Amino acid sequence: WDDIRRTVIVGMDTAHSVLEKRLGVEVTPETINEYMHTINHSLPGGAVVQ
Amino acid sequence: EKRLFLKALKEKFEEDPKEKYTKFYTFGGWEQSARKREFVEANEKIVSEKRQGIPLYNPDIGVPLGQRKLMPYKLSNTDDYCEGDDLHFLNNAAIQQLWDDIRRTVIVGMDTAHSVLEKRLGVEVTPETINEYMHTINHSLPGGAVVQEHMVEVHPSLAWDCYARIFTGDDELADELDSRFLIDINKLFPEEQAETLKAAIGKKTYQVSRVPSLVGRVCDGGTISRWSAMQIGMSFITAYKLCAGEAATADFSYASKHADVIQMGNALPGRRARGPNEPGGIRFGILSDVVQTTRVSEDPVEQSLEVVATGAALYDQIWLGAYMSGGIGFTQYATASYTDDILDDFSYYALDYVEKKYGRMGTKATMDVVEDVAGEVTLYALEQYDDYPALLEDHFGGSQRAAVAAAASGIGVCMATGNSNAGVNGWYLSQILHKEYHSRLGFYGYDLQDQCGASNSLAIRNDEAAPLELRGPNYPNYAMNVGHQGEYAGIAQAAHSARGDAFALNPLVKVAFADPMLVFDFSKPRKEIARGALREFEAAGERDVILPAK
Amino acid sequence: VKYEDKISLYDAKGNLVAENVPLEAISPLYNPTIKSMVKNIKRTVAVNLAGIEGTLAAGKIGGKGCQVPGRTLDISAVSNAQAIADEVEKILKVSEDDDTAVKIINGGKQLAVQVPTARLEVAAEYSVSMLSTAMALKEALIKTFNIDMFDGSTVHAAIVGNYPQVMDYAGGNIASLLGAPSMMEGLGYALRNIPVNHAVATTKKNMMNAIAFSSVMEQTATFEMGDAVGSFERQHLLGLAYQGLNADNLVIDFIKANAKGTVGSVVETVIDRAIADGVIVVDKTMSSGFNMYKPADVNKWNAYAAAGLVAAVAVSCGAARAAQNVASVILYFNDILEYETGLPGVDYGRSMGTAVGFSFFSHSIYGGGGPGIFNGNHVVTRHSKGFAIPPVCAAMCADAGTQMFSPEHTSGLVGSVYSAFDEFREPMKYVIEGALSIKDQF
Amino acid sequence: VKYEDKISLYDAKGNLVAENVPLEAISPLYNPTIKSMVKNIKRTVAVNLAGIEGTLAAGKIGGKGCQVPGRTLDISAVSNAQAIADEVEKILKVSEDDDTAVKIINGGKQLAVQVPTARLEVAAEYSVSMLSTAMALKEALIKTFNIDMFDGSTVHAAIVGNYPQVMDYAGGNIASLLGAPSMMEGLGYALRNIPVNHAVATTKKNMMNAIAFSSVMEQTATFEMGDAVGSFERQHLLGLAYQGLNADNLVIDFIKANAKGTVGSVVETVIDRAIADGVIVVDKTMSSGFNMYKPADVNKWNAYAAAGLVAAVAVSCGAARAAQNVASVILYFNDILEYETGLPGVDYGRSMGTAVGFSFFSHSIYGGGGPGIFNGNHVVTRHSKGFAIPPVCAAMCADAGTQMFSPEHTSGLVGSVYSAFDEFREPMKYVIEGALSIKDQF
Amino acid sequence: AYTPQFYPGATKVAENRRNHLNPNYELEKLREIPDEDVVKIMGHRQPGEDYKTVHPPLEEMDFVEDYARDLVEPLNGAKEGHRVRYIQFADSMYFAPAQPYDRSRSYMSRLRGVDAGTLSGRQVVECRESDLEEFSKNILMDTELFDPATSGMRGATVHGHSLRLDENGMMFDALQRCVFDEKTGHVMYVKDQVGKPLDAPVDVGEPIPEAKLREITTIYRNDGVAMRADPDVIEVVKRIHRARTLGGYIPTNETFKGL
Numbered sequence A: 001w002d003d004i005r006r007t008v009i010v011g012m013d014t015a016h017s018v019l020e021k022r023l024g025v026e027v028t029p030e031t032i033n034e035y036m037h038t039i040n041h042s043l044p045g046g047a048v049v050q
Numbered sequence B: 001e002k003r004l005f006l007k008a009l010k011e012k013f014e015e016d017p018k019e020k021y022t023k024f025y026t027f028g029g030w031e032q033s034a035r036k037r038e039f040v041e042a043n044e045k046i047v048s049e050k051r052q053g054i055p056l057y058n059p060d061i062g063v064p065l066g067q068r069k070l071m072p073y074k075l076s077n078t079d080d081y082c083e084g085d086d087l088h089f090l091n092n093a094a095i096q097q098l099w100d101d102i103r104r105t106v107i108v109g110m111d112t113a114h115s116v117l118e119k120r121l122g123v124e125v126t127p128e129t130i131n132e133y134m135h136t137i138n139h140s141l142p143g144g145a146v147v148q149e150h151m152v153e154v155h156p157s158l159a160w161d162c163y164a165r166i167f168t169g170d171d172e173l174a175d176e177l178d179s180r181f182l183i184d185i186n187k188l189f190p191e192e193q194a195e196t197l198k199a200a201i202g203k204k205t206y207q208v209s210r211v212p213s214l215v216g217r218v219c220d221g222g223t224i225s226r227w228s229a230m231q232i233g234m235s236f237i238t239a240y241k242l243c244a245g246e247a248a249t250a251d252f253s254y255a256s257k258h259a260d261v262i263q264m265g266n267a268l269p270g271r272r273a274r275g276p277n278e279p280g281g282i283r284f285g286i287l288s289d290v291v292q293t294t295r296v297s298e299d300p301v302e303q304s305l306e307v308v309a310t311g312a313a314l315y316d317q318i319w320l321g322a323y324m325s326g327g328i329g330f331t332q333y334a335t336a337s338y339t340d341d342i343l344d345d346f347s348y349y350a351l352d353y354v355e356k357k358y359g360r361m362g363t364k365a366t367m368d369v370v371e372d373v374a375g376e377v378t379l380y381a382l383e384q385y386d387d388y389p390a391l392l393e394d395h396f397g398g399s400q401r402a403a404v405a406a407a408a409s410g411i412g413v414c415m416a417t418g419n420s421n422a423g424v425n426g427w428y429l430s431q432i433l434h435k436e437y438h439s440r441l442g443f444y445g446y447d448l449q450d451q452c453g454a455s456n457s458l459a460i461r462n463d464e465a466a467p468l469e470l471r472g473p474n475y476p477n478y479a480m481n482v483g484h485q486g487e488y489a490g491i492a493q494a495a496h497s498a499r500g501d502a503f504a505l506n507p508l509v510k511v512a513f514a515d516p517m518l519v520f521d522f523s524k525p526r527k528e529i530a531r532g533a534l535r536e537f538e539a540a541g542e543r544d545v546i547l548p549a550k
Numbered sequence C, D: 001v002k003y004e005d006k007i008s009l010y011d012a013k014g015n016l017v018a019e020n021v022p023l024e025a026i027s028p029l030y031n032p033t034i035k036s037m038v039k040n041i042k043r044t045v046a047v048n049l050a051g052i053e054g055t056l057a058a059g060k061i062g063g064k065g066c067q068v069p070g071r072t073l074d075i076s077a078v079s080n081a082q083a084i085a086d087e088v089e090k091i092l093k094v095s096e097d098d099d100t101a102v103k104i105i106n107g108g109k110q111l112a113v114q115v116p117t118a119r120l121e122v123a124a125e126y127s128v129s130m131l132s133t134a135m136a137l138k139e140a141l142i143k144t145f146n147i148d149m150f151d152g153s154t155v156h157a158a159i160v161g162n163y164p165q166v167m168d169y170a171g172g173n174i175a176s177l178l179g180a181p182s183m184m185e186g187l188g189y190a191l192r193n194i195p196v197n198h199a200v201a202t203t204k205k206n207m208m209n210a211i212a213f214s215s216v217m218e219q220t221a222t223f224e225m226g227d228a229v230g231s232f233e234r235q236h237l238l239g240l241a242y243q244g245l246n247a248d249n250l251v252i253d254f255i256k257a258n259a260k261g262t263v264g265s266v267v268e269t270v271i272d273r274a275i276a277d278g279v280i281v282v283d284k285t286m287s288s289g290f291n292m293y294k295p296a297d298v299n300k301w302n303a304y305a306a307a308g309l310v311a312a313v314a315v316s317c318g319a320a321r322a323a324q325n326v327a328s329v330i331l332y333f334n335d336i337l338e339y340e341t342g343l344p345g346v347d348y349g350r351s352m353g354t355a356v357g358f359s360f361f362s363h364s365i366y367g368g369g370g371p372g373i374f375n376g377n378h379v380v381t382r383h384s385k386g387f388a389i390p391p392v393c394a395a396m397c398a399d400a401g402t403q404m405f406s407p408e409h410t411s412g413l414v415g416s417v418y419s420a421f422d423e424f425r426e427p428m429k430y431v432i433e434g435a436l437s438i439k440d441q442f
Numbered sequence E: 001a002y003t004p005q006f007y008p009g010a011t012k013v014a015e016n017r018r019n020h021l022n023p024n025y026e027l028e029k030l031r032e033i034p035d036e037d038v039v040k041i042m043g044h045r046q047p048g049e050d051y052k053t054v055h056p057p058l059e060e061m062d063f064v065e066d067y068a069r070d071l072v073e074p075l076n077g078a079k080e081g082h083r084v085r086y087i088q089f090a091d092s093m094y095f096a097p098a099q100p101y102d103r104s105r106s107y108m109s110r111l112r113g114v115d116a117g118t119l120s121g122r123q124v125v126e127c128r129e130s131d132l133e134e135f136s137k138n139i140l141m142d143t144e145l146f147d148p149a150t151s152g153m154r155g156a157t158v159h160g161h162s163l164r165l166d167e168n169g170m171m172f173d174a175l176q177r178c179v180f181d182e183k184t185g186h187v188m189y190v191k192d193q194v195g196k197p198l199d200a201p202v203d204v205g206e207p208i209p210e211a212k213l214r215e216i217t218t219i220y221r222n223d224g225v226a227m228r229a230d231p232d233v234i235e236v237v238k239r240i241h242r243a244r245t246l247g248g249y250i251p252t253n254e255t256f257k258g259l
């Protein structure tokens, strides 16, 4: 039950489109790898800013 | 000058608290904190063993932490210090048990059940029969199955925190009952408080069921009421043997587990969709009644501040911190209300000013007293922030300053008048006066409820009017933002501490949470949070007996 | 017209009223009486002035066992109660030729306020009545007795009670027949909220009138839920006509034929009437006899079975003079009929499922409450689309005071308020008259 | 009748229409146009026939990213749109002459159906329209394309997406302006659940018409919630008249006076006009020379401030041509007005707080989003009783395309369907006409 | 007509707040930082490239005929479809010449079509990129609104508005985007506001002396000018609070007689 309860699937395509067309930031597989490295540290409760 | 927060500032800061300058970038980063180093070692071991090389904790990415001195945190009225990481609700078992004890509590009245048994069911009800029923429910509530070995039962060691207790306003029935599972009002409360609570309760009998913590861990908060009702029905039909028919049993079931049920919290509608017994449904008066400092202390400021600490730790840290946002959470937001004696000093000054000017409760609630008391307390708190640079460094966020000053002002107004809505009005005036003083407030929106508050404090409209005791996290203005609700509960408590009231909203909750069998003793929430931050708190709900040792 | 069905209307005494009445004359979308009852239910609010006075005097604001020390107001609401009523009517008044009925109940301790329809024509839901009445009451109480500015919150808590925190009226002294729309079992379930006890008390324990009230409410709700749309409209109209309004006198005829009978005899009479009327025919005769039956008219057979279900409930609960037999009677009436004829029961098994729900809801320790608190807005009793609830009204009307959830215990205020309206006290007679008034337009 | 203050009436172009119009002429309880809008908003349903065809062709039933392999139906709903509309009209028609209409939109790609009012008279709420339309669509699709008995479930899942399991229409192709009653955050909030994007798309991105639509909906909701009764009614009447219908041409006058100005200039213009009209007077002169002002008419000052707030939002978001300045403008208009005059804000600080939360949730990680996804039912923007949403609608109308969650992205079906009705598309010119019709009845 | 009074109070801080609020008040010029240096400090774009576009120019795209929308003249960056960028500042609580709410009010009363967000630790402005750069360089940088020691432009990791200054009279910064140099006394920016390092440090000028900071700050302090010394502001605040409470209770002229 815990594994089903704690699972959430998020589509990371709208966020990429907003990063590309609103913020003018280019998204590449290297940037996605960096983002994955960051979120694997932030999701458990690590600090990234502040 | 002597201030209550001075000693903590001396212990936390190496320089003089009045010194305006210091030096940075020389602490080694995260290495200056033992907690961070322990986290790093644990992360390395956990990654290598369990995660098969997938990184978990990488301090090198993101902000370089520890550019400034990471201060330790005192706990108000307690002589022990802890790091800020120990006060996180996930790292603190004391806060988790504080929420667990409230979540797993349901109070059910047993007078309609007794009357139905006596008249409709034709079964005599005696104190011996009540004792037998209490034995049955105590065996059956955690996981038990009465005289049925073929039925699957929960491991007894897995629910050692489960109890079924009884209390009553009837003195003779109280002394005729077994003391093994009785909450004695006479010996737990002072004489005047006990008399007031007995008069408010009446001559009725109530049972308190503490569902085991593991049940609330696995399931949600709405499971507690159903578990309690089912076990109560089973124990009632087992102790008392009834040869009546089954319709009569349905009437008895309604009378016994759906007639006088008291829940800790209500269900929430819309986007806060939650069941009962969740922290967003607990009213401020209910939380004030949960905390038991009126029992052991006569100081009104201490009584209000214990409720402030409990409300901060619940509403800001658990409810808004995780239930509504999640992530790292809002620990430093709530700790600013109960770590150092800053709020203690401000509230004591407010009480002293009110006593010198208006008396303890010497004025009817008028606008002028609200304005002058709130303004004086706010000005004092803001100049205290001004002339102590270490204090401003300790409360670096404007939200962790506005809330503290406004809580002091509201507590002062509630002392002066005894009305909780006047206290919240003083809170809002303090907030806007703070904004004009420092040209600053909390976060973005943050003061949504502080610009809307003055108009909604004494309003009479449907969705705007409510006594502060009847308000809570589901109040539309208070639904989202951090840094208010825990102080609102303290202001509601201070409204009654000025009058020396035995309870605030519900006598039954006050008596039920005086039970010595609770794992978290609500008489001193600050002390227990301090104990939990030191890894010396024995929490429940651990599945140690059903897990491998390796 | 689109339905060629004709019905003959009989009153509660079994006397003929009219013949060849079009089936749509009793439809909720055409019958003026049903429209009037729906509007009155929407716009009627009951106020407990004595409850407000008691709550304010003792500071009993906040719900079950809740009480706030120091927030006590000593006002005489029951003593004034004409002044308060006049002020509330003045506040709620929209125009001069305006309904705005505020009337004194039980000599000042209760108020029966009817919010004008003008405030409901520009409302998307029925909740405007209770909110407007609460606001008007708060203003009237604050103005009549000079309440201080710092006690309006106490007055609000006494009137409404925990509303901003608890999205309902729990500890308040203002009530209505319909609950909060956010607390419905499903979409369109608002009208299935009146319990059986309220229907019995409103009609003053008259069997046929209580049956008519429950059936009218349930079938109007089915029309609201979108169920009685297209191919199901005929079945729901026939169900209403034959189960609630005693069309063709079937219910009275079955009860008279089974005065000394049992459920099985009622089943036998129902099958005999269905065969004689051409509703069902013989499908085929099996090798071991047992000539199977198939419906020549599916909807009419369902209506006949529903009327027989009501008659069987009446017969059994009048023999026992107890209202605890409803669940078993419905369940085993359907069972016996199905395995006697090879035909489907009432509502194609939904009636039997709802009867099982009644059984496990009112006959065990996991049972809860009695049959008097049954309503369609519950998870246990929502499954039948207005075919299992109306018989419970007959059962509770036949009860000789052996129920804990008697109508006198749970619906005294409701009966005192809604028994004044003629269309609520005798739903059967006035629904029949309204159907007669629109006979010629079809 | 009970209000002696008159207002002028100006169109969206600033031209005078009539003078000496009583304040009650624009009241929701009296204005025929507002009543008609509320009645029509409850019975109008938008149908996505192309969405139904696409969902059935690919088996996209279930909701977000959900496919059920094997449950695929190949139908031609868009080609047979006329036949489907005719069947739905036949099913939903009550007798002959009801106001039942199913118009064809986008060459059969969309359907705009209006269930008859007779189906809503006997309904407690507005959910009857969507459920009846869903049932009619199911029957029409089943009987037009001879869909197998084992695929009606797939058809139902295509039309409404999860309704029995999820009390909503999320994955379906049917929609309405109002949300489901289960989504309400408070009693009486049914009319507050219209998102800003829906209002902007309905009015075809016309600033004044969008302001009128949003203000009419919000103030009618405040009437429904019971907030605008008794002594609170005049404040909301004036707020609707001045902020929403530019009664004295205040909005257009302020915008004209600040064509190349800032928020502070708008504040100064508002204060100057209020002083000139006598709404506010000098209370006292302080030692520092500050002139503290007091309102000679509290509600008139509130209305003037609200009109100035709308004008300031229009000026700032037209200068920027971006709709992300709304929260800041609403916050700081009040913030500078209060400390320039010593007077309370637009809604006694209730609109400023709504802006402080709007700034929270429109620029952070904690929720919210673009200004177009907010509404009066939202937990962030429910706090101001009809004084903060019309500015948001105006600003979203002034947007040039800098928002990702634009009305085109969010409200494509709803906007296209509801723009076909003149009453919804241009509410200003019809509310003015309705007021002129009853001008002489007060 | 009506002559505005902006704020109440007779103290020096109140006068400075009034001057900041007044759009006709000429802010004193203190520095001269070229536009390229400011642009490269902001870090949104490199000086030399064309402005990126979020939507086509207003002339190319077609709009519905809206009378009430088309009589407000848009910004030059708006008709060019420029993207909306931000400039963000952190103001120290130790006599910084500009303060968050003061900054927000002055910006909303001075600039056209800007989005101002105030917070304890930082204050942010969002506008079209060309207009943002223009007004930033003209007003926010080389005026009395900016002090290189007590105010720094930080797009992320804002922390130090309430911390004690360092040994150089300089605000704390975790990312250390701007650096004080001893052998000239100037302050140099080595990173952009987000934190990306620059190719060459840009000099912003000397810090404002403390004595001058005392008489131009807009913050009330016990060591500086206190709110107790300006009773008019407190009285106005209390009047606003009472008016809000009375309007919330019952919004009638009779209720406001107790104002």
Ligand code: F43
Pocket (backbone or CB within 6 Å): A046, A047, A048, A049, A050, B325, B326, B327, B328, B329, B330, B331, B332, B333, B334, B396, B397, B398, B399, B400, B442, B443, B444, D364, D365, D366, E119, E120, E121, E122, E155, E156, E157, E158, E159, E160, E161, E162
């Ligand atoms: C990125 C945001 C936007 C947002 O939604 N939340 C942030 C970040 C978030 C993250 C921090 C993630 C991390 O550790 O890196 C969390 C923990 C929320 C969460 N569950 O993820 C949080 N803040 Ni915030 N946040 C806080 C605070 C603050 C104060 C900091 C005061 C100042 O020095 O400037 C300011 C608000 C302000 O505008 O003044 C603040 C802002 C901000 N806060 C701004 C910008 C931060 C920046 O430095 O770039 N926090 C504080 O005032 C103390 C309490 C603290 C919360 C954690 C705790 O209690 O320990 C934390 C609470």
Ligand SMILES: C[C@@H](OP(=O)(O)O)[C@H](NC(=O)/C=C\CCCCSSCCS(=O)(=O)O)C(=O)O
Pocket (backbone or CB within 6 Å): C360, C361, C362, C364, C366, C367, C368, C379, C380
């Ligand atoms: C809605 C509720 O029913 P109630 O309203 O009648 O309590 C519903 N069912 C219950 O009755 C409650 C609990 C489940 C108990 C069933 C145990 S099956 S084993 C006992 C068989 S016997 O007792 O009938 O002989 C539920 O909560 O799931």
Ligand SMILES: C[C@@H](OP(=O)(O)O)[C@H](NC(=O)CCCCCCS)C(=O)O
Pocket (backbone or CB within 6 Å): B271, B272, B320, B321, B324, B325, B479, B480, B481, B482, D361, D366, D367, D368, D369, D379, D380
């Ligand atoms: C506004 C709303 O967010 P949504 O836009 O609906 O997702 C709401 N959030 C919150 O209440 C956030 C509260 C906790 C985080 C902020 C604390 S200051 C919620 O989750 O339902």
Ligand SMILES: O=S(=O)(O)CCS
Pocket (backbone or CB within 6 Å): B443, B444, B445, D360, D363, D364, E119
């Ligand atoms: O400052 S923000 O409002 O962005 C969030 C505070 S944690």
